[PDB]
Amino acid sequence: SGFRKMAFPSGKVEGCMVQVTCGTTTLNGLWLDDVVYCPRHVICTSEDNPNYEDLLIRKSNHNFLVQAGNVQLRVIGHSMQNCVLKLKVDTANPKTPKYKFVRIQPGQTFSVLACYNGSPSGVYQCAMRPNFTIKGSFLNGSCGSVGFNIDYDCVSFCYMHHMELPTGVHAGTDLEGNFYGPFVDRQTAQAAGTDTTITVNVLAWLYAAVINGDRWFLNRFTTTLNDFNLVAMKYNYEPLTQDHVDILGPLSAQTGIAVLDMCASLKELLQNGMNGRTILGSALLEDEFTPFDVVRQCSG
Amino acid sequence: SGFRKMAFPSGKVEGCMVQVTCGTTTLNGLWLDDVVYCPRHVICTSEDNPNYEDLLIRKSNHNFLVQAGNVQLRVIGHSMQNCVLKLKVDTANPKTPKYKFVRIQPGQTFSVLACYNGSPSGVYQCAMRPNFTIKGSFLNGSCGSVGFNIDYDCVSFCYMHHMELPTGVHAGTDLEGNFYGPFVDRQTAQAAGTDTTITVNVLAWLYAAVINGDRWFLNRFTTTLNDFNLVAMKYNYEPLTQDHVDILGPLSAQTGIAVLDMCASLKELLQNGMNGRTILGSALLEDEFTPFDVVRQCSG
């Protein structure tokens, strides 16, 4: 037992991380088969309101230094797809895993492999916030670090890191180079929009707590979906849908606590607080675990 | 910026995990060069107050099934070292990293690669508690999962998982098979002893918060080491030593906040609480980050 925020084992992604250098700019790239994917930001400096089409036309293959550990990888083609650069290299990565490029939804989680100069440094879990930012840990040089999920040895890549917003949260793209949220890879006054709490995840985590022996917040009451959603709106929680209730079915069955029964507990927690008590070691309600994340750790 | 609980990239350890089966018992082992390390518990069932010396004498090499993915590894020798079994195999692991076996101190952190049937499932950070337990996430089949730190591509293994205590916390050994704390690998009423809060780590995390822009808890006061330790004892915090102050030097220098100045903030937080505010997203004081963990993420 126990419940911990847990990343996927990162080995399959570690074998894909390379360093990409163009001029005086270095960042990370992702080497799959004979293509390296990285942020197109690598082709400009600080002086470049940039036109990336013009900037790339003025580059040649030999302007791109790609290093996989010690071995230099010869660039033989270059192109741009939205905000990512694709560098064709003369060697297929022999450690390419089975993989997919997937775009994830707000409220879903993924593992981030933080990398610097093509060298992985740490791994942690992130949720895509409703406002399309993530609360990561990225220092200078982390551009091109990727986010992923792993399912039966298939790596589903969903995130490439591009920048940090003024509040210290983080924005990036899918692996097709399309930004999550209303952000751009140039210097503007862009800021994170208003955020909300992911209700279905909070309920999943309350189920995790019950499975792990925390029961003090339970009560004999049930509530209707409509009356719960009135309370949710008051506290800046997302509305709960019938599909959310359906998704929580397996956890509800395992614990014998109907979803709308648990909603009555969440309503009381929102209105009264915790009164000095904690849930799974937290004094706040946690919304960064999906129902899948809980079921993954609460099989027993 | 940002501050996240972050595990080391797990790839080097993933390449060492195997499955060890003896009879109807299966668990995880660690394959380094031509030796597999696993909990000696693998040689008994439920009926075995066991004498492990007798149990091992009654075994042969062919009683041990070791599987590295698909490939079966032939066992050619077996011996016991304290609570770990060493199985000599006829193949050196070609993916053996540079490694060391180190025993860690209470208050230090490490990454856990949770594994089932020789297959890694997730990675997370743990601190060794003052009472020599860890607050992990381990389901049935996780025995033999290992904890480690990585320094310049050298893996320092420090933990092998053995069992779960009645409070849901976890106990295990170093890789020499010596238990952390007053625990044994048989069925007793053993329980975790009283625990305390790791003061130096809480201060390191307050420094992390300042580096990341949380300043509301600061004040103009300083305190003496002796007067702080009077408050620490009252709230079940470990005493702060001069070596702790010395260790926090680099963080104190980066922020310009003397250690004893930060101690005055911690005293006020202990006596008054947070008054509805949070620090790095927590409503509780966090003690599972070492000064090293902070410096690792707060270079900027």
- Contact yes or no for B7 and A124 at CB 8 A: yes
- Nearest-neighbour CA in chain A from B219: distance (Å): 24
Q: Which residues of B touch A122 (CB under 8 A)?
A: 6-9, 296-297
Token pair belonging to A186: 């140039």
Measured distance CA(A54)–CA(A43) in Å, rounded: 11
CATH number at residue B46: 2.40.10.10
What residue type is B261 in one-letter code?
D
Answer yes or no: are the C-beta atoms of A173 and A86 closer than 8 Å: no
- Which residue in B17, B121, B123, B269 has the most chain A C-beta atoms within 10 A of its own C-beta, making it the best mutation to test that interface? B123
CA A231-A274-B264 angle, 5° bins? 130
Measured distance CA(B120)–CA(B145) in Å, rounded: 9
Answer yes or no: are the C-beta atoms of B132 and B117 closer than 8 Å: no
- Contact yes or no for A2 and B212 at CB 8 A: no
Antiparallel, parallel or unpaired: β B98-101 and B154-164 = parallel
- Chain A contact for B94 (CB, 8 A cutoff): no
For this experimental structure, what is the resolution in angstroms? 1.7
- Nearest-neighbour CA in chain A from B288: distance (Å): 12
Answer yes or no: are the C-beta atoms of A159 and A134 closer than 8 Å: yes
Measured distance CA(B45)–CA(B24) in Å, rounded: 8
The DSSP letter of residue B40 is G
- Of all residues in chain B, the one with the smallest CA distance to A135 is B2
- Chain A contact for B51 (CB, 8 A cutoff): no
Active centre residues of B (catalytic)? 41, 143
Query: How many CA atoms within 13 Å lie on the side-chain side of A200?
Result: 22
The closest CB to that of B6, out of A9, A124, A283, belongs to: A124
| Phi (first) and psi of residue B181, to 5 degrees | 80, 180
| Residue A158 designated active-site | no
Answer yes or no: are the C-beta atoms of B67 and B60 closer than 8 Å: no
- Contact yes or no for A2 and B120 at CB 8 A: no
CATH number at residue A259: 1.10.1840.10
Answer yes or no: are the C-beta atoms of B298 and B208 closer than 8 Å: yes
User: What experiment produced this structure?
Assistant: X-ray
Question: SS3 of B298, please?
Answer: coil
Radius of gyration of chain A (CA): 22
Exactly one of A143, A158, A263, A298 is catalytic; name it.
A143
- Nearest-neighbour CA in chain B from A195: distance (Å): 15
* Structural domain for A281, as ranges: 199-298
- Chain B contact for A123 (CB, 8 A cutoff): yes
What distances in angstroms separate CA A173 from CA A8, A37, A267, B2, B129, one per listed residue?
20, 12, 35, 19, 39
- Chain B contact for A113 (CB, 8 A cutoff): yes
| Residue A44 designated active-site | no
- Of all residues in chain A, the one with the smallest CA distance to B14 is A11
Q: Residue A273: CB partners within 8 Å, gap ≥ 6? A: none
- Contact yes or no for B123 and A6 at CB 8 A: yes
Measured in Å, how far apart are chain A's first and last C-alpha atoms? 7
**Judging by beta carbons within 10 Å of its beta carbon (0-12, 13-18, 19+), is residue B140 exposed, middle or buried?**
exposed
| Phi (first) and psi of residue B55, to 5 degrees | -65, -35
- Chain A contact for B114 (CB, 8 A cutoff): yes
Between helix A225-234 and helix A259-272 the angle, nearest 10°, is: 30
Token pair belonging to B138: 């381990």
Token pair belonging to B279: 């620090």
Strand (E) or helix (H) holding B19: strand B17-22
- Chain B contact for A9 (CB, 8 A cutoff): yes
Measured in Å, how far apart are chain B's first and last C-alpha atoms? 7
Measured distance CA(B190)–CA(B163) in Å, rounded: 11
The closest CB to that of B124, out of A4, A283, A296, belongs to: A4
- Contact yes or no for B11 and A7 at CB 8 A: no
- Contact yes or no for A136 and B15 at CB 8 A: no
Question: SS3 of B69, please?
Answer: coil
